[PDB]
Ligand SMILES: Cc1cc2nc3c(=O)[nH]c(=O)nc-3n(C[C@H](O)[C@H](O)[C@H](O)COP(=O)(O)O)c2cc1C
């Protein structure tokens with residue numbers, strides 16, 4: 001494999017996978033992936049990421065604790081919402097994404113109980129055998145969060161290289177106190193979780209094709 | 224195989240601080256920026272707006288930045304405050320600075336050499352191109368996280384085509400200058416990425432910045 005071809009395969013090949021098989025990723029592969037991900041750059045080489053990887057019985061207890069917290073409305077999010085977050089084209093993109101996702105799931109926006117069933121499964125990591133919880137410093141702001149994103153993408157691409165499917169999930173960060181309590185983590189903020197393992201390629205949700213805006217919408221070249 | 228290629232890309236990408244004058248071919252530049260667009264983001268919002276500057280426009284921009292710095296016209300959209308980094312994060316920052324300044328041959332009390340180096344950084348380290356990464360006006364942690372996902376996708380796509388890069392928060396400290404020179408309004412500047420082909424004879428390009436061990440950043444439980 002030539003480098004240019006490999007980058008295209010990894011970058012386009014990585015997709016948000018929402019249905020996994022139960023098979024675990026070998027421990028040596030997980031070590032190789034997370035070691036590689038640590039090579040992400042960051043402001044001043046600060047490497048602000050603290051990553052909690054959960055498997056087996058601990059992963060099962062964590063999934064049940066998230067389902068229970070969600071049922072009890074114990075929302076404990078570390079990052080507040082900012083008014084007007086998605087205006088204009090950002091809102092159009094979110095609406096189009098939601099439309100494609102629900103169409104692949106075979107659910108209509110008015111089918112509340114089916115949306116509930118789907119979201120309960122999301123808290124069970126879509127059946128993934130592993131989850132990586134991406135913790136950040138208590139004083140995380142835009143620059144540190146940018147580095148958390150550099151790391152998240154490095155990790156997802158290293159996973160893709162090993163045939164490991166992933167789903168980045170902001171949803172898991174909405175129950176940060178539950179994750180911290182389960183894992184014994186103190187004084188860190190939870191930005192997102194990444195469910196991972198091997199994709200169930202028979203699931204219609206994994207057939208969803210999410211477009212991108214393209215150069216004219218995002219990029220300008222000047223000289 | 225793909226596993227080896229990922230290792231080569233991820234480990235091969237380094238912050239390059241001395242460039243050759245040679246421009247990236249137009250078709251390669253378009254391929255790299257189109258590929259970077261495949262970065263994921265919350266709800267597929269793709270909040271990035273990227274201004275790629277080359278040639279005379281890049282020269283005018285570099286000179287405007289040098290002038291803004293000399294006149295102390297610092298304009299920051301995202302604060303970079305003292306105490307942003309504490310504990311081990313502050314020590315990693317100090318350790319990085321020590322390695323960089325040793326490669327540059329600049330001592331602690333050398334203000335004139337430090338000024339000359341800062342001027343060269345505002346000239347994009349001689350890179351023929353710079354990508355300015357603009358974010359929405361209301362950017363907070365989650366949107367900034369997506370900007371980082373994009374920035375790393377772009378740097379890795381560049382590395383795959385043998386294109387060296389340096390992500391630079393420094394360029395975001397003169398946000399009004401960048402906006403005025405590029406006709407950009409109502410977007411915040413998070414960082415710039417200088418890019419082109421590495422000058423392999425430059426001592427600064429020999430620096431190798433380590434990472435904390437896997438045991439230091441990651442915990443596995445079952
Ligand atoms: C930081 C971040 C948070 C995300 N949060 C969720 C989430 O909570 N649940 C979910 O189903 N997908 C989530 N997504 C996945 C996307 O919606 C997805 O990346 C986008 O639709 C682009 O599709 P693709 O990744 O398949 O190319 C998240 C993506 C990112 C980068």
Ligand SMILES: Cc1cc2nc3c(=O)[nH]c(=O)nc-3n(C[C@H](O)[C@H](O)[C@H](O)COP(=O)(O)O)c2cc1C
Nearest residue numbers: 041042043044045237238319390391392393414432
């Ligand atoms: C968001 C971001 C901002 C950065 N700002 C600068 C900068 O202003 N000037 C600079 O020389 N390097 C800057 N760096 C580059 C690093 O310091 C570098 O990525 C870190 O030391 C790790 O080294 P490596 O990328 O060579 O592996 C920045 C890196 C990132 C990811």
